[PDB]
Amino acid sequence: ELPQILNDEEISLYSFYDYANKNFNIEKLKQKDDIFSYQKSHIKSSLLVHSDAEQTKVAVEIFSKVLHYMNSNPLVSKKDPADFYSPVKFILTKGLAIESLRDEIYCQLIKQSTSNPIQDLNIRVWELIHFTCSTFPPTRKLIKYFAAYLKTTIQQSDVSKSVKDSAQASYFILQRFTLNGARKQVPSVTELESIKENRPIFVRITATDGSLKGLHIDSATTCQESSNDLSQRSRMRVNSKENGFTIIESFNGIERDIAPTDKLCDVLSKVENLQATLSIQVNFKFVFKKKLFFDNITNNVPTTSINVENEFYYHQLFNDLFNSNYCKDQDYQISIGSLKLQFESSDYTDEIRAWLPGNGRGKYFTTDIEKNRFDDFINKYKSHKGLSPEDAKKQMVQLLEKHPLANCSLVVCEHQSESLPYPKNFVLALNVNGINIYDPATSKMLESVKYSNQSQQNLKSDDKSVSIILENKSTLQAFTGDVQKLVSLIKEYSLYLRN
């Protein structure tokens, strides 16, 4: 299991009493109530000392937000989750972005959960503790004291089940983030709801065959963990680094790479952010797709697993070859789509023909083909006997496997150079053989760019492009919408080949 943040034997060495006497802003905090334990009134200054006057002011506001959450009606959480969590969002946004306020926040939560007379309030503070642990840790100056506080809470008698469950889940999520590294976003409402109730976040991942897979994750769950989990659950090879699958984000059809160490919950936050930014129009999916094409089979692995992987991939490739950015050959699209129809629907009927327009779009033909070559399609379809599902499927897979773009990681690009020979719009098709420049207009490979020519620790890229070095030492500045995908593909193929 995960390494302890603090051993049981060190619990007695790290007492918050000592931390608080040495670090609290005692003079400026002078008040009626005890400064070191629960109080119902606002604090008159920050708990810790901030040289930045603005951070002192914000620390005081944070405390008001803590009080507000502690005192809020359980009914708001159901009727208006956005309102219910607003004070939480304020706290976590400040702490995540401003490292020098993190210990302040934790000290306020320790304080408000110390000698807290009312059980329901103690429960609210421990929910806050758990939200905070799920977002950022205390700094190295406080973390051992806070960890001692957690373990003491977990190990001693007292606290309701709710406080103890929150404390245990808080300690564990701190361990998970120590393992998986920092996150980048404040929890969405959906995540906070799960954290509050001490349960996993449930996410739905779409597979290439359109099927819906469920995963139970936590705040620290990475793309790599979830990609491995989905692989194992689909009975593929269990290591996504071997099978080459990852989970990507899809917003209204536009796909973006998710890095292996990136947190899926951070993607959920972005979704919520966009929903607000657009004020519905948000068609978001996670998608489980094949990213990397390694020649690493056997490794004497069950062919059964390799087979599940390959079926997911055929759906992906078929769909990509229906994408005009990758393929413009109507004859070809007709040939694969007509076989797919024979497989799924069997022999032609006038009832099928009457069903196609609109329905078959993206499934058996492209809109372009529904408009300019329907009859040509209906004709190729009629042509297939008699074809058994087995034969129909085998022929389709053959046509797919022999396409130039089969078994390549695909990236849509453009360039603006006046001294390079390629067309403005091209595809980079990356595989173990190199970085291939492909022209989707003619279905031809134009050049095979070498991984061995790229800078190993200084690959040049920006927000919109990656600069790839050609054999003659000139640079192709490939513009692409998903720069991270292109950069990571170059790095991952290079590393694989190195080993």
Q: Residues interacting with Cl ion, by CB under 5 A?
A: 49-52, 55, 100
Nearer Cβ to Cl ion (36/293): 36
Task: Give alpha helix (H) positions in 48-80.
Answer: 53-71, 76-79
- The neighbour count for residue 90, using CB atoms within 10 Å, is 19
Q: What whole-number distance in Å separates Cα of residue 22 and Cα of residue 205?
A: 49
Output 45 or 395, the one with its CB closest to Cl ion.
45
Q: Closer CB to Cl ion, residue 52 or residue 344?
A: 52
- Least distance between Cl ion and beta carbon 35 (Å): 13
Nearest to Cl ion of 71, 100 (CB atom): 100
- What 72-78 contacts at long range (C-beta under 8 Å, 24+ apart), as own/partner pairs, is 72/124, 77/196
Output the smallest distance, CB 55 to Cl ion, in A.
Answer: 5
Q: Minimal distance in Å, beta carbon 107 to Cl ion? A: 13
Shortest distance, position 141 Cβ to Cl ion, whole Å: 13
Q: What whole-number distance in Å separates Cα of residue 4 and Cα of residue 68?
A: 33
Contact 46, 55 (CB under 8 A): yes
Q: Using omega within 30 degrees of 0 as the cis cutoff, is the peptide bond preceding 386 cis?
A: yes
| Strand pairing report for 284-290 and 201-207 | parallel
State which amino acid sits at residue 339.
L
Q: Least distance (Å) from Cl ion to the CB of residue 50? A: 4
What are the φ and ψ backbone dihedral angles of 10, each rounded to 5 degrees? -100, -5
CB of 186 to Cl ion, least distance (A): 21
Give the residue with the Cβ less far from Cl ion, 100 or 273: 100
* CB of 254 closer than 8 Å to CB of 481: yes
**CB nearer to Cl ion: pick between 111 and 263:** 111
Q: What is the 3-state secondary structure (H, E, C) of 297-345?
A: CCCCCCHHHHHHHHHHHHHHHHHHHCCCCCCCCHHHHHHHHHHHHHHHH
Q: By beta-carbon distance, which residue lies closest to Cl ion?
A: 50
Question: Could you tell me how many residues make up the chain?
Answer: 499
CB of 27 to Cl ion, least distance (A): 8
Residue 196: CB minimum distance to Cl ion, A: 30
Considering the complex, what minimum distance in angstroms separates the CB of residue 258 from Cl ion? 34
Sign of the Cα pseudo-torsion (87, 88, 94, 99, in order): positive
Euclidean distance between CA atoms 197 and 194, whole angstroms:
5
**Which tokens belong to 321?**
């070859």
Residues contacting residue 195 through CB under 8 Å, at least 6 positions apart: 127, 130, 131, 134, 169, 187, 219
Residue number with CB closer to Cl ion (137 or 440): 137
CB of 125 to Cl ion, least distance (A): 24
Give the whole-angstrom CA distance, residue 146 versus residue 321.
55
Task: Tell me which amino acid residue 10 is.
Answer: E
State which residue, 19 or 438, has the beta carbon closest to Cl ion: 19
Closer by beta carbon to Cl ion, 51 or else 300:
51
Q: Which is nearer to Cl ion, 51 or 277 (CB)?
A: 51
